Design an enzyme around this catalytic site. Sequence first.
Site, short mmCIF file in Angstrom:
data_model
loop_
_atom_site.label_atom_id
_atom_site.label_comp_id
_atom_site.label_asym_id
_atom_site.label_seq_id
_atom_site.Cartn_x
_atom_site.Cartn_y
_atom_site.Cartn_z
N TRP B 82 0.70 -1.27 0.00
CA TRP B 82 0.03 0.01 0.02
C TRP B 82 0.91 1.30 0.19
O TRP B 82 0.20 2.24 -0.08
CB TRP B 82 -0.86 -0.03 1.30
CG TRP B 82 -1.57 -1.09 1.59
CD1 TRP B 82 -1.22 -1.96 2.46
CD2 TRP B 82 -2.70 -1.79 0.95
NE1 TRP B 82 -2.05 -3.28 2.34
CE2 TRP B 82 -3.00 -3.06 1.34
CE3 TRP B 82 -3.78 -1.16 0.18
CZ2 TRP B 82 -4.01 -3.81 1.20
CZ3 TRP B 82 -4.76 -2.15 -0.21
CH2 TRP B 82 -4.88 -3.47 0.24
N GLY B 118 -7.87 5.91 4.58
CA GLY B 118 -8.30 6.87 5.52
C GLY B 118 -8.17 8.63 5.27
O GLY B 118 -8.20 8.95 6.30
N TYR B 129 -4.14 -1.52 -8.23
CA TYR B 129 -5.03 -0.89 -8.71
C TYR B 129 -4.91 -0.73 -10.27
O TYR B 129 -5.34 0.02 -10.82
CB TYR B 129 -5.23 0.49 -8.15
CG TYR B 129 -5.35 0.43 -6.41
CD1 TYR B 129 -6.39 -0.35 -5.84
CD2 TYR B 129 -4.93 1.50 -5.79
CE1 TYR B 129 -6.56 -0.28 -4.76
CE2 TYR B 129 -5.18 1.61 -4.42
CZ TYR B 129 -5.94 0.84 -3.70
OH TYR B 129 -6.08 0.74 -2.53
N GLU B 198 -13.11 1.60 -2.18
CA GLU B 198 -12.93 0.77 -1.19
C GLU B 198 -12.32 1.54 0.05
O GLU B 198 -11.76 2.44 -0.30
CB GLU B 198 -11.83 -0.56 -1.31
CG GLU B 198 -11.74 -1.52 -0.03
CD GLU B 198 -10.84 -1.02 0.81
OE1 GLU B 198 -9.84 -0.21 0.33
OE2 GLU B 198 -10.74 -1.57 1.70
N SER B 199 -12.79 1.14 1.36
CA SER B 199 -12.27 1.83 2.50
C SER B 199 -12.82 3.49 2.36
O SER B 199 -14.18 3.79 2.12
CB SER B 199 -10.86 1.96 2.55
OG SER B 199 -10.43 2.33 3.99
N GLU B 330 -12.93 -7.41 9.22
CA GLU B 330 -12.70 -5.93 8.82
C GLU B 330 -11.67 -5.27 9.89
O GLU B 330 -10.82 -4.60 9.54
CB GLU B 330 -14.04 -5.35 8.85
CG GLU B 330 -14.87 -5.55 7.83
CD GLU B 330 -14.50 -4.77 6.40
OE1 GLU B 330 -13.62 -3.95 6.57
OE2 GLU B 330 -14.84 -5.21 5.21
N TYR B 333 -6.75 -6.01 11.56
CA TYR B 333 -5.65 -5.26 11.29
C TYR B 333 -5.35 -4.08 11.87
O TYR B 333 -4.09 -3.96 12.43
CB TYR B 333 -5.25 -5.12 9.67
CG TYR B 333 -5.02 -3.75 9.21
CD1 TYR B 333 -4.10 -2.94 9.57
CD2 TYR B 333 -6.04 -3.01 8.56
CE1 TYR B 333 -3.83 -1.55 8.90
CE2 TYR B 333 -6.17 -1.90 8.00
CZ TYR B 333 -4.86 -0.98 8.28
OH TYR B 333 -4.75 0.07 8.15
N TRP B 435 0.35 -11.56 6.11
CA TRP B 435 -0.15 -11.31 7.37
C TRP B 435 -0.51 -12.68 8.15
O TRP B 435 -1.04 -13.67 7.33
CB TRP B 435 -1.12 -10.43 7.56
CG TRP B 435 -1.00 -9.27 6.68
CD1 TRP B 435 -1.11 -8.67 5.56
CD2 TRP B 435 -0.25 -7.89 7.36
NE1 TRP B 435 -0.55 -7.49 5.25
CE2 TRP B 435 0.00 -6.79 6.42
CE3 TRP B 435 0.31 -7.60 8.75
CZ2 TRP B 435 0.48 -5.54 6.74
CZ3 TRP B 435 0.51 -6.25 8.97
CH2 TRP B 435 0.82 -5.32 7.87
N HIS B 443 -9.41 -6.12 6.16
CA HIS B 443 -9.72 -4.72 5.41
C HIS B 443 -8.69 -4.57 4.02
O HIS B 443 -7.46 -4.42 4.35
CB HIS B 443 -9.37 -3.71 6.32
CG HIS B 443 -9.98 -2.44 6.14
ND1 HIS B 443 -11.35 -2.38 5.93
CD2 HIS B 443 -9.68 -1.27 5.59
CE1 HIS B 443 -11.63 -0.99 5.34
NE2 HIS B 443 -10.48 -0.35 5.42
N1 LIG Z 1 -2.43 0.09 5.02
C1 LIG Z 1 -3.22 -0.59 4.69
C2 LIG Z 1 -4.43 -0.11 3.81
C3 LIG Z 1 -5.56 -1.40 3.62
N2 LIG Z 1 -5.38 -2.50 4.32
C4 LIG Z 1 -4.28 -2.91 5.05
C5 LIG Z 1 -4.21 -4.17 5.55
C6 LIG Z 1 -3.18 -4.29 6.49
CL1 LIG Z 1 -3.49 -5.99 6.95
C7 LIG Z 1 -2.17 -3.65 6.70
C8 LIG Z 1 -2.30 -2.42 6.17
C9 LIG Z 1 -3.30 -2.03 5.44
C10 LIG Z 1 -6.74 -0.83 2.79
C11 LIG Z 1 -6.93 0.63 2.67
C12 LIG Z 1 -7.14 1.14 3.95
C13 LIG Z 1 -6.39 1.77 4.71
C14 LIG Z 1 -6.79 2.62 6.05
C15 LIG Z 1 -8.26 2.62 6.25
O1 LIG Z 1 -8.94 3.54 5.05
C16 LIG Z 1 -4.88 1.93 4.07
C17 LIG Z 1 -4.46 1.18 3.16
C18 LIG Z 1 -5.72 1.19 2.13
#
Ligand SMILES: Nc1c2c(nc3cc(Cl)ccc13)C[C@H]1C=C(CCO)C[C@@H]2C1
Lengths: 563, 563
Positions: B82, B118, B129, B198-199, B330, B333, B435, B443
Amino acid sequence: DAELLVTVRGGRLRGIRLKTPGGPVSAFLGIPFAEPPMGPRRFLPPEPKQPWSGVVDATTFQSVCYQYVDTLYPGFEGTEMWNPNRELSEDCLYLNVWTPYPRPTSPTPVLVWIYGGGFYSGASSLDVYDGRFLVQAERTVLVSMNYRVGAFGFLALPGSREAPGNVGLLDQRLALQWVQENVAAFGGDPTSVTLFGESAGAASVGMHLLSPPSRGLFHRAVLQSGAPNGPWATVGMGEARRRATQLAHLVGCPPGGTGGNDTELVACLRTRPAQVLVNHEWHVLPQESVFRFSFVPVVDGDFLSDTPEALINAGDFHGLQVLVGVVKDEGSYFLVYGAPGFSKDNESLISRAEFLAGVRVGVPQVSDLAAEAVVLHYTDWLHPEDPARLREALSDVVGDHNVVCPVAQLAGRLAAQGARVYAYVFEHRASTLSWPLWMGVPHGYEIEFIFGIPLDPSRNYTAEEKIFAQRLMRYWANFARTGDPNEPRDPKAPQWPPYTAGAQQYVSLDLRPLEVRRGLRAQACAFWNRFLPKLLSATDTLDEAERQWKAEFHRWSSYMVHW
Amino acid sequence: DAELLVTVRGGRLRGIRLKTPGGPVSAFLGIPFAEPPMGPRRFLPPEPKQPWSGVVDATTFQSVCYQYVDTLYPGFEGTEMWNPNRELSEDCLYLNVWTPYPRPTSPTPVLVWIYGGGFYSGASSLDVYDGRFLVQAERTVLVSMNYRVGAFGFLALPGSREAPGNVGLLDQRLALQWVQENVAAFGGDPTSVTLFGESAGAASVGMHLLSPPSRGLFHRAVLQSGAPNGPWATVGMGEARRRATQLAHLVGCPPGGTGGNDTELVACLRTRPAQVLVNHEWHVLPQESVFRFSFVPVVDGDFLSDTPEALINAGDFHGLQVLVGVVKDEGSYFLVYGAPGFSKDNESLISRAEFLAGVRVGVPQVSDLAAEAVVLHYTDWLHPEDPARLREALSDVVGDHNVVCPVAQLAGRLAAQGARVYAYVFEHRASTLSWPLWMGVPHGYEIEFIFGIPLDPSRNYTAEEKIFAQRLMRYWANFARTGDPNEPRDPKAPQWPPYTAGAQQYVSLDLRPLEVRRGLRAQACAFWNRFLPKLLSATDTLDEAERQWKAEFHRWSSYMVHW
Ligand SMILES: Nc1c2c(nc3cc(Cl)ccc13)C[C@H]1C=C(CCO)C[C@@H]2C1
Ligand SMILES: *[C@@H]1O[C@H](CO[C@H]2O[C@@H](C)[C@@H](O)[C@@H](O)[C@@H]2O)[C@@H](O[C@@H]2O[C@H](CO)[C@@H](O)[C@H](O)[C@H]2NC(C)=O)[C@H](O)[C@H]1NC(C)=O
Ligand SMILES: *[C@@H]1O[C@H](CO[C@H]2O[C@@H](C)[C@@H](O)[C@@H](O)[C@@H]2O)[C@@H](O[C@@H]2O[C@H](CO)[C@@H](O)[C@H](O)[C@H]2NC(C)=O)[C@H](O)[C@H]1NC(C)=O
Ligand SMILES: Nc1c2c(nc3cc(Cl)ccc13)C[C@H]1C=C(CCO)C[C@@H]2C1
Ligand SMILES: [Cl-]
Ligand SMILES: [Cl-]
Ligand SMILES: [Cl-]
Ligand SMILES: [Cl-]
Ligand SMILES: [Cl-]
Ligand SMILES: [Cl-]
Ligand SMILES: [Cl-]
Ligand SMILES: [Cl-]
Ligand SMILES: [Cl-]
Ligand SMILES: [Cl-]
Ligand SMILES: [Cl-]
Ligand SMILES: [Cl-]
Ligand SMILES: [Cl-]
Ligand SMILES: [Cl-]
Ligand SMILES: [Cl-]
Ligand SMILES: [Cl-]
Ligand SMILES: [Cl-]
Ligand SMILES: [Cl-]
Ligand SMILES: [Cl-]
Ligand SMILES: [Cl-]
């Protein structure tokens, strides 16, 4: 007759032989055990029966203690089952002994029965409380007794010598003292006395565990669908003075002060006919509620040192074996006493609107936020509108609040503090039952099986129910004898394990063999026993703060009308 | 090249062909769609990109919007997935188009992707993506775009012209306007635009449904593991002025008044390097919490007329088809970000003591009595101490509060007010996952399957997962095309029924075929959505009354020290 003639400390008695399908039984019924609590003696603790010249007629049940007769459903079969058979009197303090035939040669275990009925009703004479089958089958001695109910037994003016409250429980004690003295005359063994009660009867049993003056009078306890710590079983000192003073007032009795109070109140109260007192009994109940009763034991500092829940946590319980349980549908029957929707004549398929309303009736005296919490928990949120599901829900609400959760808390506290405890759920609907299907196995319908009433040939019970009762009597006798229900040793029948605080195991008593289940309505009880109080506490200090805000806005508003 | 050369309203573009196992794709990445939001333009809504002489290089992803880089676990595989791949800039407002090969002859459905993170992180450039598989497989046009995050996108000083908040969502809008103009240049059909995010991406999508200025810019919405009405997605006006003023203060910026405020504040704020602003980002978060973010959309009256929940109940939604869902685990993490007990390096087998503590962290800003209620509900009272059960519990707490219950409320409110809604639970753990097992399907791990990333040969995905993604892409495409995911017609595959308010049906997306389930964490959501607020409300008017009682005891106590 061989031996229907017996001499106990007070005098000689003449009994009667009773037929059972198995064999015979020697019964001595209506043995006076206290001086008749009338005139000056009304509301006063029982004085022991003075001894008598002559042979006392113990061939027949003495008159039932003065009480209200429940007549919601006139001429209904399943409602007159609990109604007074013998006539009504204040001269009602008598007890009854069933001993095997022939009288046993070695001292044998004793079972003492204490009836239920909200402390407002009940009698040891009721046909469902006949000890002949249980005594014939298990060859033990069974004793039951009348005790004062209603105002005559529980009207308190806490701290007065003339009406100290709890005399109904004193009646029960006096009989147990009688049992230590005279039970050997029948083959009974005053060193193996097991108390068993159902409903308020069970709540009584529980109070004898909690009152040290009684502890030397028994050795085991069985609590059936009741507990001394239930919300309907005790009342405060303040609250019972209110109820007794309201009753006094209705009935025309001045309080005040020059000599008494409260001597002049209670003096006036004794001039009243018994019926006048019973007429005005239910007026004194504070709220809207179901499963609440006017005159119940008071926490006076005397009989009960502190509140039952307090005593329960503190107490040491080593050397005690107690057997606890409940029926499948404890709450069910009560909802016909004013929960909107319920009658014994339709399937009481309540609307959600009726559900929400009855929550306020089944759970009395609770803030708005609290009933929201009851709804939240007892609603299937996948079927919020489903009428059958809402019916069962308000029935579990009433059951869990009044019976299953007080009992569960007790059994945990005991087990974890020294008692060996065994828990059961009695989930078998009698085939002779006359109440609607939606009631299921209602409050008090295990009793007829424990006393082996199915064995009565006149009664239309089924073959496997007869067998069922015998299995049940054996369970109960193995308890009174040994303090363990599951036989002396281990047959091929599944073993009933002690209820403990952690695993919380219990058994299911129905026609199918013993099934062990872990968890006694565990999730519900967390709400009732752990969470709800932390809530009510807050809504209490919030209803005190919304009260100070209207007082402070009343004077604020007037400072505006001036302006 | 045949056709990697395309002319959109602003000017000409040169693209790149992308290989996929199925065939090829024409991609045009890094198309500037707004004037670079730097210098005087920082914090200001996007101005549309002026048109250009020359051929713009659209062969490669433009730099990622300025953001914090999450580096809890340095050098960890599943954490850099990410993280920003392209360099960081404020000059980041660019978008990307994948269109089939060859460019289609009739206008075809468009999918527009809005990333999550976030509102503090994210980029359309991330390898997960990549639109090439989804476009090649389903032959539709896919567009994604960068939008400003963190302070650069969401710092609000509500009601100022210089920092009005919500500009991050304005970026998203501007791209959609660009889509109406220029998407036909690629074979796209501006009359069939389906938003999917998403998110926070999903929360954005939801806000475009709620803002009328955007409604003419799309026709379908897909909300993945997020909703505009979640507790982390919006902040009040009062609250965002506080956060922006604190940030100003930390970073050294005087407020006041003679010209501005707040013009002189924001003016000073623009002189600051971008890093200085990101350094101080997380300081401004009020409480202890997990799943909360500093700068998120504000309810200003502008973009959002009222609070998302308000708009949701009121709105008419006829003529809308929206597809909603969540992953299996959800909440999981987030607990490694400060819930005592949790690390990705042990099985996080928390003690009950650690459970109780983390409830206060996973559910921020709640009275004592409220967390008691969370405990009550999320505790198995048959196994209160069980560490694995307590781990899953705090994970459902965080999940249900932040994701599953906001989404469920939405989907009910939509469905029951005109929208045809389809709900899913994505419960398949990627085999390439890095993980710990206790996180399950966390999530954001459905995303890699929707974009058909398993098909990437370099990636080590399994055969049935490849097939799984194809099934999933088809589900999604059938939605964007027709507003119904379950094929045009009915194969032998089980049919996905619309989620409604009553039956609440949904499907389970894993390797096994579609299973229909009734009830979307129904019982939990009753607590969160119906009960909890009636409670918090009261504890609010109780924490106001315990505050007036200490003020009134402070002056009372001093009247005693005088005495
Ligand atoms: N940095 C992460 C992200 C996301 N999922 C993650 C899962 C894990 Cl296990 C560890 C890290 C993660 C999905 C999206 C949501 C967020 C935060 C919630 O909006 C940040 C990024 C994109
Ligand atoms: C089930 O019964 C109750 C009340 O008792 C009803 O059923 C029989 C016992 C018979 O006496 C019958 O005439 C009697 O009405 C019903 O609730 C009552 O509804 C009436 C209007 O019909 C109201 O005015 C009453 O307040 C209300 N009483 C109580 C005790 O709730 C109820 O309708 C019925 N359920 C159904 C729908 O079958
Ligand atoms: C699971 O992990 C946490 C914290 O992280 C631990 O695990 C590895 C990542 C490694 O860094 C290891 O050295 C580290 O301690 C443990 O909780 C911590 O416990 C310590 C004492 O050991 C406390 O002082 C810390 O406050 C506390 N931190 C956190 C984040 O809670 C935890 O013990 C462990 N679980 C078990 C028992 O296996
Ligand atoms: N009058 C009744 C009684 C009992 N059960 C009853 C069941 C039904 Cl369905 C209808 C009527 C009933 C069991 C005991 C308990 C009580 C009231 C609770 O202490 C009274 C009596 C004895
Ligand atoms: Cl007879
Ligand atoms: Cl004589
Ligand atoms: Cl014998
Ligand atoms: Cl009191
Ligand atoms: Cl304690
Ligand atoms: Cl004790
Ligand atoms: Cl409701
Ligand atoms: Cl013994
Ligand atoms: Cl339960
Ligand atoms: Cl609790
Ligand atoms: Cl490539
Ligand atoms: Cl040119
Ligand atoms: Cl085509
Ligand atoms: Cl506000
Ligand atoms: Cl509404
Ligand atoms: Cl609308
Ligand atoms: Cl606890
Ligand atoms: Cl269409
Ligand atoms: Cl649930
Ligand atoms: Cl509610």
